Amino acid sequence: MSNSAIPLNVVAVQEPRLELNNERTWVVVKGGQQVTYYPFPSTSFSSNQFNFICNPPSAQTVLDRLVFIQVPYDITFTANPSHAGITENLLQPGRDAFRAFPISSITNTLNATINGFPVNIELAQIIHALSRYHTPLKVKNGWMSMQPSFEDNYQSYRDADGANNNPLGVFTSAAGLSELPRGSYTMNVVTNTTTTARITGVLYEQVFLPPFLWDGEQAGGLANLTSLTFNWVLNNNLARIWSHSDITNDVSGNSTIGSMNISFQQPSMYLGFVTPRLNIPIPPRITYPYFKLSRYTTQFQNTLAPNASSTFKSNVVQLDSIPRKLYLFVKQSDNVIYQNLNNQITTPDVFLQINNLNLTWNNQQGILSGASSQNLYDFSVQNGYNKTWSEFNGVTQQFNGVSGQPTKVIGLEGGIVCLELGKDVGLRDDEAEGVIGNFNLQVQMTVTNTNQYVTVTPDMYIVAVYDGTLVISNTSAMASIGVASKEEVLNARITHGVSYNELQRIYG
Amino acid sequence: MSNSAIPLNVVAVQEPRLELNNERTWVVVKGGQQVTYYPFPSTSFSSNQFNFICNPPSAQTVLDRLVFIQVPYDITFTANPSHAGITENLLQPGRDAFRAFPISSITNTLNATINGFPVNIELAQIIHALSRYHTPLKVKNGWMSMQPSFEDNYQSYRDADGANNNPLGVFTSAAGLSELPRGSYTMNVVTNTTTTARITGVLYEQVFLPPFLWDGEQAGGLANLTSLTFNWVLNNNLARIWSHSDITNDVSGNSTIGSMNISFQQPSMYLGFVTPRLNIPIPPRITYPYFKLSRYTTQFQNTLAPNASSTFKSNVVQLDSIPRKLYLFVKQSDNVIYQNLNNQITTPDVFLQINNLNLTWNNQQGILSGASSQNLYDFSVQNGYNKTWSEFNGVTQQFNGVSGQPTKVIGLEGGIVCLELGKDVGLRDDEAEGVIGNFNLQVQMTVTNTNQYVTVTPDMYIVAVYDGTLVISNTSAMASIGVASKEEVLNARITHGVSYNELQRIYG
Amino acid sequence: MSNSAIPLNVVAVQEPRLELNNERTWVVVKGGQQVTYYPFPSTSFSSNQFNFICNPPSAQTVLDRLVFIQVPYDITFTANPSHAGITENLLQPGRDAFRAFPISSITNTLNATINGFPVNIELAQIIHALSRYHTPLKVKNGWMSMQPSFEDNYQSYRDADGANNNPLGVFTSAAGLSELPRGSYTMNVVTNTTTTARITGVLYEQVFLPPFLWDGEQAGGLANLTSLTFNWVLNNNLARIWSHSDITNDVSGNSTIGSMNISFQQPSMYLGFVTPRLNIPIPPRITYPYFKLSRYTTQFQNTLAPNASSTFKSNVVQLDSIPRKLYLFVKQSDNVIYQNLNNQITTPDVFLQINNLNLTWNNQQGILSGASSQNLYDFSVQNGYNKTWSEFNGVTQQFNGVSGQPTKVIGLEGGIVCLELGKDVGLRDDEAEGVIGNFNLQVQMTVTNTNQYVTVTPDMYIVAVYDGTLVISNTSAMASIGVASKEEVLNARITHGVSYNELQRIYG
Amino acid sequence: LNLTWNNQQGILSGASSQNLYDFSVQNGYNKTWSEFNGVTQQFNGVSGQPT
Amino acid sequence: FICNPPSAQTVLDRLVFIQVPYDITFTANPSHAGITENLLQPGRDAFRAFP
Amino acid sequence: EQVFLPPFLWDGEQAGGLANLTSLTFNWVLNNNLARIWSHSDITNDVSGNSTIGSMNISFQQPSMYLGFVTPRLNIPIPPRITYPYFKLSRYTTQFQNTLA
Amino acid sequence: ISSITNTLNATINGFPVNIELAQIIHALSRYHTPLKVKNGWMSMQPSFEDN
């Protein structure tokens, strides 16, 4: 203990096999009394919007935080009278299945108002990036599993087939105790043939906007609500539900499917209301951690193909307070991939490889100008990334062992970097993650196209996540951003008690 | 900070990469000298029942909680008239293995008395409920790796082959760093052809019942034991160890295999005695957590198939104390499947899917009656269920792409609902998880059968598990359920001190 | 308080869905402004070694602990007379890729020196063992992702092909969200044809050693220092990087690839320097944890194959002080492997299965006399071995059905056992994990060759990782192993407060 | 048999079924132990009928 | 058997008794003889009290 | 077979016996090979040469220890604690690569 | 018996004491045994040593 440089302080700690004596105490867990689950069928269902409206059953009834919606559907596929034939059934064995996650992807935006104060998220583009992390295998296999749940690994569908890993494959051929593929999802096929297909089933999608939560950890519910109500506005296109293989086309190519039609029936929200026991009282005014997702995007004209590099400067935006975390990635332009659906149906979901990024924050320029993209990966894989480096910086050479052929490249997926703010930007003195008011930033970042066939017009995104503390009372719905003040962030007394991991846990 | 509706208090933390100052210590890790191990061979095994007895050295030596029993064996199959067929080697590469877990599945009951007070667990059917439940990948792949322990995921072997996640395949063919399938576990084949086969080896299985533990972490091992004697008793049938696939057997229902016999050579069991340091002594009398499984089973006359629904009524019961946890899985009956081996060897280990359940705890009915099947899955996963929503409620549309066959449906696995009474049912006030009184349940429920192949008569279940404290002192074994009084439980000084989750771990 | 032989007091705990009242505090995280990365090119690099030298921006600037070096290369192969014809492309589709972790395994020994005091470990023999030990799925699929990382589980590359689980294959065949086979890694290719090949690419590898860490978590960056430098002194063979397969080459031990020549370009190493915030200061002399792992080996000439059994003895050595841990394992033929290009390329790094082992400490022998080879896998997965029992001690029965082909056994990796000294070996009271000085240890153990074709000639290493403090202060940095004294270890106040499964988390 | 009380749990778990008959007979049970726990064998004298 | 009391203060009872499972086999002798019939007889044999 | 090791003996020369234990336990572990228990002479075997003998299987049946306890008489009383002598037998071994014939 | 047995441990009053037996005994045997003692106790196992 003593006898090294400065003398240290000493504790002995018991082994596991034997303590054996320590002060053990019987603990009683107590949550009561009646726990329930209701099915509020959506009032006013349509092809344009689902709307639910559902008020908690009783006074001081706390409300659980996992919410979701099931929606029975019907779809028919029709053949396009070109390229024919056209031999073999329209739907194929390891070729075609749902896009993950389906409903959320085809939602233009969903709204919910907790107790008369409105909260909304942008489900369409936010998702496929917010889904990539912070996911672990444990969690992926849990709550998430209900909605089609697997990602898009390959830069384009054509190559993929057929892999032991192929994104749209039937359940058999998925390795035991591991993320299964999107062909697994069970729904009945009424008739499958040349010129005609039709199918029916029922898809569970999670409500994805905090406070509500989708990671398997559990935290307090929102008493004391008076009236919750949701609202789903569907994205106009509706073909985007389906995925496809570019292969089956083939050689012309007008994709064999010539069209589609998608229909719905009433779908029901599913909330759970616990009610507390008389003895223990809940306080009349309580506070919760509420985050906020917004996205600022930019357009462009100059395209690259198939493997050329370039540069893009973003667009000056303003943010009302220092964000907790911040995401930044390039992507194949939304403007296009919308007309001429077949591309829309068979086009995958992956991001161009970030060669380097250089961001000018408030009063700085060139921050992380010298970090090797490699460097940009290590942080954060720390924040949550969960994809392997190989996926990042998408490319893989797979040789073919026969004379004489060119070997061939594949592209997997783009990097989707993020920078927690006080950690990887370095926040100026006397200021901290919480603080108001205004700031502004624009990221100028070079990137490359790596997908081997198409000419990819790009765009940039930037998903910010603010940290706020909102109070729900009855009846009130206060919400605040920038709760900390400048004087308080200077000389806030520190603690050795908690540590950065536990902080990691809260979100989510 | 005092910027919220109600003022909140601030603290600071330091980012991981810099404290850089806080008090450090040096933590020396003291563990009693002289850890030993020894194989205790079975005093008077037999073919019917075998049983070991061992005495710990003295009052002061702490035995450890992880115990297991290894058993050497041989078998021999012989091709029957009149199926053949009778072609190829009687075993085939993709089609044969041991049942997970092999000797566990045969035990009628394992009894183990400690220090003079006998605690026992029935094991034939109680083992499969507990098997899917609490393990995650990283712990599945640790200790529980010794028994051939990969869960049967299809509704019949027949369909399985050949998927690279098939429940009984060869080592190669199983993906990298994953749970490897049943076939992979080694034993030597002395011979194999048509008309005959003979294998020899040694299968480990770790004795399951608590106190002794099968999950990775260590809790103080029983001491100060005076004497301890296990003894098993096996089902006469015994043919259940081996499992075999369907495809190979020919039509006319004729089976390649029947019949065959097993052999055992005297088996052993490995205990681990540790003895503490000179100066640190263990208290005269100590107190361990004491769990207690039970099984209640109800069978009916009616039958459903090949995929029609039914509802059923569990028998009424009276429960001495609210139990911690309950399991409610309905499985293909035991009445059949001990009659006529080929079927007995062949049948998998999956149960029917739950369309929904209606439950009544005391004096209330309709608990969970409006909660859709999907909801059950979520709470079960929350308890640790670990299987994806696709298999729970299993069925899968794997679709053909040939003009013009119909498109196969697969029966997949099973669902096994679990509830925790405080977490899930909600106990009336003044009552909590440990308390005693007489609360009658009776669980009605509706179910569909899913495997396409056979008619099924179904026997429902309910496993309950009480939580008690048992004190060991040499030699005594007092044990008591509900320690635990109504007024004391009501008064309940409550600590915002301990988390829930840490509490979750010392299951169960 | 009440009802156990000993009354034990109570506390009630609120269910996760309902707190809902507890001291909620807004917490801000603060780390120094500006963390910036610099790329140091390396002057003085050669095929015989790499040399780095780096001045910090100054003192007062905490240097982050994660480090890595990116190196560009140029390899050309040429065809072998005269096994020819060698029809078909020199490099095969599934057959041949990079060994892992390429630049680490090639490095004969690695030295770095923090701020004047030299701290170096040996890389070539140490890493293939220490690799296994402290990684789950997330941690291995994270930072260690950058260099190829899939282990050599198969006993020879001959048998692997063509397996779904094969050690070195194209990214196409893998199970979604799990470690990729080494083949996925990019190897940008210039050309290949029978009679030649040329590949060129950039590979990243992280410094391995202490303090700097290759693990998931992260801790406080070293400060405050003036000088740092790294020396990679490469091994003299340099052909070892690439790995081949024997199936392709038959049959005189004449192999396609002999011979070839690797080349490097100028390598650069990246490290980032955070600067703390002026207001809260960092002390003038900071004290870290410091580990260092010295190996001990023995050469034997007694030859055994293909699967004969034998026994060995280590030879005596005299460790200075108790070491924190100790990895013992037999591994094949270190001298034997090097002669021949053929040998360097086409042989894996698996080690033979321990049939049983006995060990002697100081003053006692026959520690673990009768602990089943299996009992040795039971600990450790307690110290995180991270493989299945099956593959440990791995032999594989795989049967083939046709009449008549004898079923074939398959080689597999063998156990590498470990034991932390307090936990297993047991210790004379007054001796703990740190205390100096003298002790003497000899290992005896019986191993059995398990692969088929090649007769192995053994040697067995015994790595031992010491524990100790290191204080880095600006002028000079000092370290003690044996930071504890004898009288202080005895009678060190024991703490029920800190948990033991926390010490698992420390390293590494 | 293994009866419980109100939290004194498992009383009488380990006492052989024979041990049960003993303490019972002290309260007066009054019949040979052979006929309590009643199963008896009669072996047959003729080739080769089962007993 | 080695059997200690759990404490001083425990008062053990006077009636003790052992139980013991057994296995007997007999094999007929030549030359009798003899013999027609089974080896055990409905009246001829049992255990000697007290075995 | 006599059990060997201290405090038991051996060369008798009998001496003051151990009192006063509460428990006592013996384990043996036997090397897997087990063929070492027999002897044989090279003369019988063939010239090349093969041995007339390989192979063989060995078994056991209940094997049992034997130990006697005196008890002291009421007149002469034996101490609460008593000290015996006791030794331990270490072994260290090292082998060399060179052969010599 | 001793030559075949790898090791042997006899715990006294709770604390273990053991002596590897396989290798030790052959050399220790030749040592302390007179002709009187060779015909004494040691006589029980085969005893005559290798010349």
mmCIF file of C-alpha atoms in Angstrom, chain C residues 147-283:
data_model
loop_
_atom_site.group_PDB
_atom_site.id
_atom_site.type_symbol
_atom_site.label_atom_id
_atom_site.label_comp_id
_atom_site.label_asym_id
_atom_site.label_seq_id
_atom_site.Cartn_x
_atom_site.Cartn_y
_atom_site.Cartn_z
ATOM 1 C CA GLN C 147 -7.258 -4.968 -37.772
ATOM 2 C CA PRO C 148 -8.568 -8.394 -38.897
ATOM 3 C CA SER C 149 -9.715 -10.165 -35.726
ATOM 4 C CA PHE C 150 -11.397 -13.541 -36.295
ATOM 5 C CA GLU C 151 -9.643 -16.310 -34.364
ATOM 6 C CA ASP C 152 -8.151 -19.521 -35.667
ATOM 7 C CA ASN C 153 -10.678 -21.986 -34.283
ATOM 8 C CA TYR C 154 -9.958 -24.769 -36.786
ATOM 9 C CA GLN C 155 -7.024 -27.100 -36.223
ATOM 10 C CA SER C 156 -5.985 -26.795 -39.868
ATOM 11 C CA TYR C 157 -7.187 -24.722 -42.804
ATOM 12 C CA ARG C 158 -7.324 -27.955 -44.771
ATOM 13 C CA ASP C 159 -10.547 -29.130 -43.117
ATOM 14 C CA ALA C 160 -12.325 -25.763 -42.864
ATOM 15 C CA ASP C 161 -13.254 -25.322 -46.565
ATOM 16 C CA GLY C 162 -15.942 -24.928 -47.426
ATOM 17 C CA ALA C 163 -17.650 -24.077 -44.124
ATOM 18 C CA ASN C 164 -20.130 -21.363 -43.229
ATOM 19 C CA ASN C 165 -18.097 -20.823 -40.088
ATOM 20 C CA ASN C 166 -14.716 -20.913 -41.799
ATOM 21 C CA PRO C 167 -11.990 -18.803 -40.219
ATOM 22 C CA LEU C 168 -11.057 -16.816 -43.291
ATOM 23 C CA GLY C 169 -13.786 -16.216 -45.879
ATOM 24 C CA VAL C 170 -15.558 -13.455 -47.827
ATOM 25 C CA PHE C 171 -17.827 -11.059 -45.989
ATOM 26 C CA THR C 172 -20.717 -12.392 -47.973
ATOM 27 C CA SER C 173 -20.937 -15.485 -45.815
ATOM 28 C CA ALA C 174 -21.372 -14.518 -42.168
ATOM 29 C CA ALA C 175 -24.235 -14.193 -39.700
ATOM 30 C CA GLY C 176 -25.738 -10.698 -39.492
ATOM 31 C CA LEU C 177 -24.298 -8.722 -36.584
ATOM 32 C CA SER C 178 -21.348 -10.896 -35.546
ATOM 33 C CA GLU C 179 -17.582 -10.898 -36.089
ATOM 34 C CA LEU C 180 -16.567 -11.046 -39.735
ATOM 35 C CA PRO C 181 -14.136 -13.570 -41.187
ATOM 36 C CA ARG C 182 -10.648 -12.144 -41.965
ATOM 37 C CA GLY C 183 -11.382 -12.300 -45.703
ATOM 38 C CA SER C 184 -13.764 -9.342 -45.608
ATOM 39 C CA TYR C 185 -10.898 -6.876 -45.024
ATOM 40 C CA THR C 186 -10.049 -4.683 -47.984
ATOM 41 C CA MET C 187 -6.983 -5.679 -49.949
ATOM 42 C CA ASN C 188 -7.024 -3.383 -52.913
ATOM 43 C CA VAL C 189 -5.620 -5.518 -55.720
ATOM 44 C CA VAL C 190 -3.360 -4.490 -58.620
ATOM 45 C CA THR C 191 -3.570 -7.747 -60.562
ATOM 46 C CA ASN C 192 -3.639 -11.499 -60.165
ATOM 47 C CA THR C 193 -3.290 -14.477 -62.468
ATOM 48 C CA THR C 194 -1.894 -17.969 -62.218
ATOM 49 C CA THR C 195 1.827 -17.354 -61.818
ATOM 50 C CA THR C 196 1.366 -14.053 -60.021
ATOM 51 C CA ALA C 197 -0.460 -11.584 -57.783
ATOM 52 C CA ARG C 198 -0.064 -8.041 -56.429
ATOM 53 C CA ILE C 199 -2.051 -6.463 -53.617
ATOM 54 C CA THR C 200 -1.820 -2.994 -52.040
ATOM 55 C CA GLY C 201 -3.666 -1.405 -49.117
ATOM 56 C CA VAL C 202 -3.578 0.331 -45.751
ATOM 57 C CA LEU C 203 -3.968 -1.498 -42.428
ATOM 58 C CA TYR C 204 -4.618 -0.202 -38.929
ATOM 59 C CA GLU C 205 -3.448 -1.804 -35.699
ATOM 60 C CA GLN C 206 -3.682 -0.588 -32.122
ATOM 61 C CA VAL C 207 -0.747 -0.490 -29.733
ATOM 62 C CA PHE C 208 -1.026 -3.327 -27.220
ATOM 63 C CA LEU C 209 0.528 -2.966 -23.805
ATOM 64 C CA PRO C 210 0.114 -0.953 -20.621
ATOM 65 C CA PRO C 211 -1.083 1.501 -19.894
ATOM 66 C CA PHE C 212 -2.508 2.199 -23.315
ATOM 67 C CA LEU C 213 -5.599 0.061 -23.731
ATOM 68 C CA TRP C 214 -7.239 -2.021 -26.483
ATOM 69 C CA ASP C 215 -10.396 -2.652 -24.494
ATOM 70 C CA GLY C 216 -13.934 -1.182 -24.584
ATOM 71 C CA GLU C 217 -14.136 1.199 -21.600
ATOM 72 C CA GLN C 218 -11.424 3.898 -21.275
ATOM 73 C CA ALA C 219 -9.962 5.769 -18.268
ATOM 74 C CA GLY C 220 -7.860 8.878 -17.398
ATOM 75 C CA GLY C 221 -5.281 9.948 -19.971
ATOM 76 C CA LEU C 222 -1.609 9.993 -19.050
ATOM 77 C CA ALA C 223 -0.175 13.292 -17.882
ATOM 78 C CA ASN C 224 1.879 15.211 -17.449
ATOM 79 C CA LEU C 225 4.630 14.199 -19.763
ATOM 80 C CA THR C 226 7.386 15.641 -21.988
ATOM 81 C CA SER C 227 8.473 12.812 -24.254
ATOM 82 C CA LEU C 228 7.024 9.688 -25.792
ATOM 83 C CA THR C 229 8.371 7.291 -28.380
ATOM 84 C CA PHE C 230 7.509 3.989 -30.016
ATOM 85 C CA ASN C 231 9.810 1.406 -31.571
ATOM 86 C CA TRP C 232 8.414 -1.491 -33.492
ATOM 87 C CA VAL C 233 11.315 -3.857 -34.007
ATOM 88 C CA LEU C 234 9.923 -6.145 -36.670
ATOM 89 C CA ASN C 235 10.656 -9.877 -36.862
ATOM 90 C CA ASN C 236 13.122 -11.064 -39.501
ATOM 91 C CA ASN C 237 10.799 -13.378 -41.523
ATOM 92 C CA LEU C 238 8.000 -11.041 -42.616
ATOM 93 C CA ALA C 239 6.240 -13.707 -44.713
ATOM 94 C CA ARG C 240 4.091 -14.660 -41.703
ATOM 95 C CA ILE C 241 1.575 -11.836 -42.343
ATOM 96 C CA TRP C 242 -0.325 -13.778 -45.062
ATOM 97 C CA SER C 243 -2.090 -17.069 -44.414
ATOM 98 C CA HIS C 244 -2.677 -19.950 -46.872
ATOM 99 C CA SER C 245 -4.661 -23.205 -47.154
ATOM 100 C CA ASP C 246 -3.359 -26.728 -47.769
ATOM 101 C CA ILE C 247 -6.340 -28.067 -49.723
ATOM 102 C CA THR C 248 -5.209 -26.110 -52.739
ATOM 103 C CA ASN C 249 -1.719 -27.567 -52.612
ATOM 104 C CA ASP C 250 -0.850 -31.218 -53.114
ATOM 105 C CA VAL C 251 1.005 -33.382 -52.757
ATOM 106 C CA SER C 252 4.778 -33.445 -52.059
ATOM 107 C CA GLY C 253 4.433 -30.630 -49.598
ATOM 108 C CA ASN C 254 4.826 -28.485 -52.694
ATOM 109 C CA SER C 255 2.661 -25.385 -52.449
ATOM 110 C CA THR C 256 1.419 -22.801 -54.976
ATOM 111 C CA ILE C 257 2.559 -19.581 -53.272
ATOM 112 C CA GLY C 258 6.303 -20.097 -52.673
ATOM 113 C CA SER C 259 7.817 -17.633 -53.003
ATOM 114 C CA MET C 260 7.155 -13.866 -52.416
ATOM 115 C CA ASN C 261 8.271 -10.432 -51.047
ATOM 116 C CA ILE C 262 6.518 -7.781 -48.975
ATOM 117 C CA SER C 263 7.232 -4.022 -48.962
ATOM 118 C CA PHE C 264 6.089 -1.135 -46.780
ATOM 119 C CA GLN C 265 5.637 2.574 -47.430
ATOM 120 C CA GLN C 266 6.055 5.325 -44.794
ATOM 121 C CA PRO C 267 3.789 4.595 -41.779
ATOM 122 C CA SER C 268 2.174 7.235 -39.528
ATOM 123 C CA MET C 269 0.832 6.978 -36.016
ATOM 124 C CA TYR C 270 -2.162 8.922 -34.689
ATOM 125 C CA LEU C 271 -2.604 10.201 -31.171
ATOM 126 C CA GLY C 272 -4.876 12.935 -29.775
ATOM 127 C CA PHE C 273 -4.160 15.454 -27.000
ATOM 128 C CA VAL C 274 -6.962 16.877 -24.845
ATOM 129 C CA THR C 275 -6.307 20.074 -22.941
ATOM 130 C CA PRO C 276 -8.021 20.510 -19.575
ATOM 131 C CA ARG C 277 -10.082 23.601 -18.679
ATOM 132 C CA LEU C 278 -8.117 26.404 -16.980
ATOM 133 C CA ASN C 279 -10.447 26.832 -14.020
ATOM 134 C CA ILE C 280 -10.367 23.364 -12.383
ATOM 135 C CA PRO C 281 -6.646 22.329 -12.184
ATOM 136 C CA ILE C 282 -4.848 18.924 -12.494
ATOM 137 C CA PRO C 283 -2.174 18.036 -9.825
#
